């Protein structure tokens, strides 16, 4: 199958720094871009940042940009999205999606598409 | 010859002739004096002994042991990938062995006048140990410098102790050559005839080898009853085709069967109580158990399953400086067979079913499942795959019958394999141990591929883009290590 | 930025009676809008992609349709089991932008 | 012995390879899940008794007297592709039992079948692993009416066919079959035929075990009885596709070879459960199905003239007894098969460049000649 | 025709390991914590000396079909008439054969010499295959009969009739 495992859980202090981890397996890690969207207590969901499959392209949210940090590591499949100088308002339920879109490094092209496989998500009060 | 004259150099590489490949390593080992020049007899009543399938019998004896049986012994990480990606077949043809650069130490200061004691059992008259998956090869990384292990057997028991019928064996009873600072070994071995490893995943799978555009001329038992109701019972026969192609008449079957124990690599899906052992399948062997493992050649796992695994059923290979007992999941590297998913049967799964009754007017038809299948006519499977780090030969045991003798393991089975090679420093006592150079040479037959396959092959790959090491290469500290077990099956075939 | 918005907020509807919700987006982006809905307490799953495009394992009574500004998600044969919020995407540009959502 | 036949060549999928999967024939079950492709190439199929100890020794093939006609008028300039593969390259779809065999009867014209192949599919889905073959990849010889082609092939070694009907050797290996009556009445009044059924599963997938290990037919003095997919099964001339009842159909029965094999319906024998002991009496049970054992003797599934000649041994690391389930010897390299299709010639293009491919094509097939010489 | 092996293995099937040395396999040792609700694991150790069942091995026992054990002491037995009702058959064309001596298997286990197997004796013994071949009245060993789950602990059966299976090895029957 296709299989994410995020937790980061937290329970942290404005300003405090915390670093969501998610396990991916069952696809080619490198070639679909992982994702990351949020959603607070009772309101919509809110994308917040995306990572090209070979990690050239970060893609970061308006509110978001420079607070938080996208990255992979492809020893251990694991997509991670540290975010330092947290604020209340980030505090929500995070899920990490995987692309519904294949791509490889032979061709520029935009790495986002759809958000085809989600994940049960982890909670980050503050 | 001299101590200012060298005996050897340091030959490593690989070469890529033609249809063949000659690969040579070089490595630098130390023997230290084992068990103090003596012959220490062993048995479960040293240790405790506690359990009747665990209790043994035998000696340990002061020599070492040179064991090459590894394949990343042989191969570079990139030896490994030329030949996996370019070929559907190879097989060891001519070995080459050498022993040279000796140096004989006292506890520490060079001691000139001493001999290493070092001989070849070519007629096999010991018991043979290196099929068995030990430790104390040669490195993986050509730099290193690693110890020789210590030679020892096992014979016949009851219990801890001995019978009439138990052996012993003096390895210094046989003759030997002693070798000097200055002296060199040297010995070619010819392998006997093995078939090629099949290293390719078949493009087509055991079922599916119909033409699925026409109608076979057999018919199939469609309909025993005409609806329902009393007395519906009625027969109708069909054709078998592409709209139903489970019930055609196929000419062969896939292979034999022992089930395992699956278990979930998610640990909330697998069941809250042990049963490791209790679980387990096994053989029994004159009222002692032994685990079944790896067992018989079968897919790990039905296809879209990647999170169940056989119990005992796959190698499992340790990631750098695992620990020895009790290691969590992710130390450990576990190998999945599905490659074979085309011919061989799913370790976890039943084979198939049997009618176990004779239906009637009052009895229904009744199944059961068919946990075990040995061999049928009409069967067609796939050996287990060879691994980098996988064992290369093994023996095969003296016997009045085998079947299909590729050891379960893995690898070319032999009735008379490379020999075991026995070295010790020749003898209260000076403190002394000794060092020096090895090379071994090993010739390999390839089998090209030739397929007229439109689309490309699947191919290994270093797939990483930005990561802080290079796989299959040194770290800060300098420690190697073998990132992933590679299997042997990218290239295709035709079923 | 771009804004998607749409247009019911809530809604309720009886059950095997056609039920339509649309999202208007701020430019003309195509056919790059997708479709999600989401249960309480369970992650989003993806209906529809590339405007109309559906997912391997979302029923034949899902449907879309529009480009460039306007799009529609259509649900022929409501059941019992399409209840919950339901939100419209962009794929178009980056930053992505997801609707308001719709409770049905 | 010799033939001769007449074919009739159609043009396949207009020219045009096509994927295929049960997707798009409805979609059916997991067990009857596929992929594959469907060529515009056909193919000849001489594999059946009738289109002719013993064994095959040679074999030659004749190709000759090519006549295409254009939908009727002759078109004499037109060529028919024509070439064996040798090297076993393509799939091989002649030991499965498929229609499209030469006519048993000299004077009949046969339409030739179309080849397409399966591959690897995880459903109606294909893996990186499904391989994809292009049949205009291989070299081939084209043949205008003028032309002919032949070739002659070597059978492989194998052993002649068997035609005959406190111990130290033991009956062969069993694998139980339902039992199923000729009378109706004998028969239990419930859907069995699917649910009882002796199966092998393989990556999921159910196959039914068919025909199955060579087993006699049914017990001495019961000829009423036959194993459900235990036995071969040929349909009378003219006998209907689906559901057709049972006096429509022929039924081998193997009841020949009830010395040397279990009964396919009988189990094999009993095996002691336990150890006995003063409290305990000594309890058996029934070995359902049994694989080899030494000191086992068999006789293999007898030939038919209906039945197929040969069939080809998968390349694998091992087998047992390569000799097929459905009879017939069993060959590493059978005879090669043999792709034919009728050359496109195309309409005429438009007076303006226009990069794509043609899709209109001058209707068109073709007929000859067949000649196959077979030494026993 | 081949040499008959007439010598005795000084070797068992299951000890032809090296002692002394790990394997450098693991096996799977632990499956839960201890003693509480949801305590699941998977803890691998190295095959080793100290464990010599779990190891690796290349080759296993041939194939076996049990027979029942008889006791030379009568009043050990069961006492009903078991000769023919408990014998080990295999049937022919609806004519059931005993089986005799059939599989070539160890007549007894070691320590148990009074014991000799129904039909698997001429009485003389086999008990020096017992190295490479299964005792004639025990079982081959066990598979497994169900998946596991939470809600399903692992079930296992007794193989009664194991046939052959590739790398099997075996001694015949002596003369």
New interface residues.
């Given amino acids: 199958?296709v299989?994410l495992l995020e937790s980061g859980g937290g329970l942290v202090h404005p300003g405090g720094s915390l670093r969501l981890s998610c396990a991916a397996?069952?696809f080619?890690?490198?070639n679909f871009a992982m994702s990351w969207?949020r959603?607070a207590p009772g309101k919509?969901?809110?994308?917040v940042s995306?990572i090209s499959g070979?990690?050239?392209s970060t893609?970061?949210?308006?509110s978001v940009r420079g607070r938080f940090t996208i990255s992979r590591?492809?020893?251990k499949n694991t997509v991670y999205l540290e975010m330092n100088s947290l604020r209340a308002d980030d505090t929500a339920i995070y899920?990490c999606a995987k692309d519904?879109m294949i791509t490889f490094?032979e061709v520029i092209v935009?790495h986002?598409?759809?958000?085809?496989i989600?994940?049960?998500?982890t909670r980050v009060a503050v | 010859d001299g101590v200012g004259s060298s005996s050897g150099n340091w030959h490593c590489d690989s070469q890529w002739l033609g249809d063949r490949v000659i690969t040579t390593s070089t490595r630098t080992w130390a023997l230290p004096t084992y068990n103090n020049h003596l012959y220490k007899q062993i048995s479960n009543s040293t240790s405790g002994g506690s359990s009747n399938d665990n209790a043994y019998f035998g000696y340990s004896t002061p020599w070492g042991y040179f064991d090459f049986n590894r394949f990343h012994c042989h191969f570079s990480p990139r030896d490994w990938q030329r030949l996996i990606n370019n070929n559907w077949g190879f097989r060891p043809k001519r070995l080459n062995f050498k022993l040279f650069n000796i140096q004989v130490k006292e506890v520490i200061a060079n001691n000139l006048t001493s001999t290493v004691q070092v001989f070849t059992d070519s007629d096999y008259q010991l018991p043979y140990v290196l099929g068995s998956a030990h430790e104390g090869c040669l490195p993986p990384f050509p730099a290193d410098v690693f110890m020789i292990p210590q030679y020892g057997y096992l014979t016949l028991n009851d219990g801890s102790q001995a019978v009439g019928r138990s052996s012993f064996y003096c390895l210094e009873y046989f003759p030997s050559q002693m070798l000097r600072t200055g002296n060199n070994f040297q010995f070619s071995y010819e392998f006997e005839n093995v078939p090629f490893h099949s290293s390719y995943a078949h493009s087509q799978s055991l079922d599916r080898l119909m033409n699925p555009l026409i109608d076979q001329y057999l018919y199939y038992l469609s309909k025993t009853i005409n609806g329902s109701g009393q007395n519906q019972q009625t027969l109708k026969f069909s054709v078998a085709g592409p709209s139903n192609m489970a019930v055609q008449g196929r000419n062969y079957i896939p292979g034999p069967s022992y089930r395992q124990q699956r278990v979930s690599t998610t640990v909330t899906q697998n069941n809250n109580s042990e049963f490791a052992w209790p679980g387990a399948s096994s053989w029994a062997l004159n009222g002692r158990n032994s685990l079944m493992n790896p067992g018989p050649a079968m897919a790990s796992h039905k296809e879209?399953?990647?999170?169940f695994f056989p119990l005992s059923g796959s190698l499992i290979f340790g990631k750098q400086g695992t620990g020895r007992d009790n290691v969590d999941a992710d130390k450990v590297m576990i190998t999945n067979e599905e490659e074979i998913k085309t011919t061989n049967p799913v370790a976890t799964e039943s084979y198939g079913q049997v009618a176990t009754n004779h239906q009637s007017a009052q009895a229904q038809a009744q199944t059961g499942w068919v946990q075990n299948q040995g061999i049928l006519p009409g069967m067609v499977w796939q050996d287990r795959d060879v691994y980098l780090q996988g064992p290369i030969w093994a023996k095969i045991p003296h016997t009045d019958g085998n079947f299909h003798p590729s050891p379960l393991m893995g690898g070319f089975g032999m009735k008379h394999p490379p020999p075991q090679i026995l070295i010790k420093n020749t003898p209260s006592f000076i403190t002394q141990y000794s060092t020096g150079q090895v090379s071994v040479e090993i010739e390999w037959e390839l089998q090209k591929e030739n397929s007229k396959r439109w689309n490309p092959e699947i191919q290994y790959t270093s797939?990483?883009?930005?990561?802080?090491?290079v796989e299959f290469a040194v770290n800060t500290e300098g420690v190697y290590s073998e990132?992933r077990p590679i299997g042997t099956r990218y290239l295709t075939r035709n079923l | 930025?771009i804004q998607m918005t749409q247009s019911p907020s809530s809604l309720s509807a009886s059950v095997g009676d056609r039920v339509t919700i649309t999202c208007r987006a701020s430019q003309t982006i195509s056919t790059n809008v997708?479709w999600?809905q989401?249960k309480p307490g369970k992650?989003?799953?993806?209906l529809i992609?590339?405007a109309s495009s559906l997912?391997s394992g979302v029923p034949s009574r899902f449907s879309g349709s529009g480009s460039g500004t306007d799009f529609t998600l259509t649900i022929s044969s409501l059941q019992p089991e399409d209840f919950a919020?339901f939100?419209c995407?962009q794929?178009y540009?980056?930053?992505?932008?997801?609707?308001?959502?719709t409770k049905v």
């Avoid at chain 3, 992650?43 to 993806?46: D, E, M, N, Q, V």
């Fill in positions: 199958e299989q397996s069952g080619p890690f490198s969207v959603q919509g969901l809110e994308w995306t070979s990690s050239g893609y970061y949210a308006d590591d492809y020893s899920y519904r490094g935009k986002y598409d759809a958000f085809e989600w994940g049960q998500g | 879209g399953e990647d999170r797939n990483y883009y930005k990561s802080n090491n990132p | 930025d997708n999600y989401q992650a989003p799953k993806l992609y590339a997912q919020t939100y995407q794929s540009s980056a930053p992505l932008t997801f609707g308001e959502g």
